[PDB]
Homo-oligomer: A and B are copies of this chain.
């Protein structure tokens, strides 16, 4: 589409050579700054070489500006169950004289338990004593050694993805297109490197917007059913039992199994209960829908309306009413990149065909320009009031661009030049005025609002008071005279009617 906010920060900053025989370049390095733009615009970065007449540009596309948070840590919390078993034996020797562990023996496995498995998981090797008598199983009124082992299992295999975060910094999406032809997308952060791709390190800056009631919130998501919910989650390994933050593990594939070497649990997560050689285990782990302040996918806590935006690397968003933030300018840094230049530009000449759009407003005024040349794309339009750059194709085609004007009757003479050749163009048409749209029920904001032009807010005597009757060349005086005569006639008629009414009301009472 169209483009605006040119920079031209590091023009003529190359140290190339003949260029592989005919014309080539090596690298261009510098630093520039891109101001804030409305959602659905393009910021072009036009380079200039001392030898070549013109060069290509670098367009920056922004679609949505959502309120997301950073990624402090990532883990998976699987669901667990209650599994336990025991065994009843007799002393029958000197191994169980008084107690089972003499001083510190915790290995309560006599090469018989099922703990030596890959699906067993985490547990605690506990033990207790027994009783004596014919009903207790032995022939000695003395405590008998009775071992017990408990663990946790996961038959279903439901996997959860929790990511604690407490920053909630503004962010947006960027659809960057390299001058070579490659088009990729990435999500920049407010101060975090965005995985620089071939030198370009364009980052986004915010305004540090405060939150109303966002203190302990996370972005726990489900994988199988793709269900999202907002609930306060735990912190890193050093945690407390009582809320979310139960037995975790290393990775996602290691979450189906609760085995050791990757799974982390502090203490007191499964209880043991036994009366007479039973060793029954009760469940104490709370599910995700058990803590307080458990929200759902649609959340309207405070002024923010947290929706579920389909996007990679993040599924949490939200957009309040029109905010009109202060600034959202970017910062672009270069490290290394190549760009080929033709420097074989020939005669090119275009003209204006149509013109339409709003007044000085958000969408602006779109103007269609038709060109014809042999070169692929060598053009740079420059005029007063606004500057717009775009790309063309080989042959004769039609293109639509948008410019910013500050006058209803657009009748000027702009200069158009493609590559090295220059010409003159003219624009003539009628424009209209559109204000900021109003809010309607049933509609919710999706990403954000950038800015609305509400500066003048005053009627202009030039545009107004004209289209009611017309406009010739020197008939304005006659029109004013006719307006005055009609006004005087209507005044006399109204006065006569009022006098007749007063005369009728006074007499004949």
A41 within 8 A of B: no
Q: How far is the CB of A301 from chain B (nearest CB, A)?
A: 18
Is A59 positioned at the interface, with any CB of B under 8 Å from its CB?
A: no
Interface pair B254/A128, CB less than 8 Å apart = yes
Contacts of A127 in B (CB 8 A): 250
The answer, yes or no, to whether A99 is at the interface (CB within 8 Å) is: yes
Q: Which single member of B100, B252, B261, B292 contacts A275 (CB below 8 Å)?
A: B252
Establish whether residues B208 and A262, one from each chain, have CB atoms under 8 Å apart when the complex forms.
no
Q: Is A129 on the interface with B (CB-CB < 8 A)?
A: yes
CB of B259 within 8 A of CB of A99, answer: yes
- Chain B residues, CB < 8 A from A98: 259-261
Which of the residues B101, B208, B274 comes within 8 Å of A252, measured between beta carbons?
B274
What are the residues of chain B within 8 A of A128 when measuring CB–CB?
Answer: 250-251, 253-254, 262
Contacts of A23 in B (CB 8 A): none
Counting chain A residues whose Cβ lies within 8 A of the other chain, the interface size class is: 20 to 34
Q: Is A130 an interface residue (CB 8 A)?
A: yes
Cβ 8 A contact of A261, one of B99, B256, B261, B276: B99
Contact of A130 among B208, B253, B259 (CB under 8 A): B253
Instruction: List residues 89-129 of chain A with CB under 8 A from any CB of chain B.
Output: 98-101, 127-129
Q: Is A158 an interface residue (CB 8 A)?
A: no
Q: Which residues of B contact A200 (CB under 8 A)?
A: none
Asked whether A143 and B276 contact (CB < 8 A) given A99-B259, A99-B261, the answer is: no
Q: Is A277 an interface residue (CB 8 A)?
A: yes
Does A257 reach chain B (CB closer than 8 Å)?
A: yes
User: How many copies of this chain?
Assistant: 2
Question: Which B residues touch A253, using CB under 8 A?
Answer: 128-131, 136, 143, 146, 275-277
* Given A98-B261, A143-B257: A274 touches B251 (CB 8 Å cut-off): yes
Q: How far is the CB of A268 from chain B (nearest CB, A)?
A: 8
- Residue from A128, A130, A136, A261 whose CB has the most chain B CB atoms within 10 Å: A261
Main secondary structure, interface of A, reads: loop
Instruction: List A residues 373-410 near B (Cβ within 8 Å).
Output: none
Most buried by B among A251, A274, A292: A251
Contacts of A250 in B (CB 8 A): 127-129
Residues on the B chain within 8 Å of A223, using CB: 275
Measured in the bound complex, the distance between the Cα atoms of B262 and A254 in whole Å is 36
- A245, B255: Cα distance in complex, Å: 35
Chain B residues contacting A274 (CB-CB under 8 Å) are 251-252
Bound: A239/B298 CA distance, A: 40
Do the beta carbons of B208 and A259 come within 8 Å of each other?
A: no
Which partner residue on chain B sits nearest A291 by CB separation?
Answer: B208
A233 CB → nearest B CB, Å: 15
Chain B contacts for A292, CB-based, 8 A:
208
How many whole Å from A261's CB to the nearest CB in chain B?
3
Contact B130 A254 (CB under 8 A): yes
Interface residues of A in 236-275 (CB under 8 A from B): 250-254, 256-257, 259-262, 274-275
With the chains together, A277 CA to B252 CA distance in Å? 10
Q: Decide: B262 and A99 in contact? CB cutoff 8 A.
A: yes
Give the nearest-CB partner of A290 in chain B: B208
Which residues does chain B contribute within 8 Å of A277, judged by CB atoms? 253
Neighbour of A143 across the interface among B208, B259, B275, CB < 8 A: B259
Given A208-B292, A292-B208, A276:B259 Cβ within 8 A: no
User: How many Å from the CB of A245 to the closest CB on chain B?
Assistant: 18
Q: Using a CB-CB cutoff of 8 Å, which residues 128-144 of chain A contact chain B?
A: 128-131, 136, 143
Chain B CB within 10 Å, residue with most, of A130, A143, A208, A259: A143
Q: Do B208 and A261 touch across chains, with their CB atoms under 8 A apart?
A: no
> A98, A129, A223, A274 — which one has the most chain B CB atoms within 10 A of its CB?
A129
Evaluate contact between B129 and A254: CB separation under 8 angstroms.
yes
Minimum CB–CB distance from A259 to chain B (whole Å) comes to 6
Closest to A141 in B: B256
Q: How far is the CB of A292 from chain B (nearest CB, A)?
A: 7
The residue of chain B having its C-beta at the shortest distance from the C-beta of A144 within the complex is: B253
Contacts from A to B (Cβ < 8 Å) = 98-101, 127-131, 136, 143, 146, 208, 223, 250-254, 256-257, 259-262, 274-277, 292
A-B contact pairs, 17 of them (CB 8 A): A98-B260, A98-B261, A99-B260, A99-B262, A101-B261, A127-B250, A128-B253, A129-B250, A129-B257, A131-B256, A143-B254, A223-B275, A251-B275, A252-B275, A252-B276, A253-B275, A253-B276
Pick the 5 closest A-B CB pairs, nearest first. Answer: A99-B261, A129-B254, A131-B253, A128-B250, A128-B251
**Besides A98-B259, A146-B253, 20 other CB < 8 A contacts?**
A99-B261, A99-B262, A101-B261, A127-B250, A128-B251, A128-B254, A128-B262, A129-B251, A129-B261, A131-B254, A131-B256, A136-B253, A143-B253, A143-B259, A208-B292, A223-B275, A251-B274, A251-B275, A252-B275, A253-B275
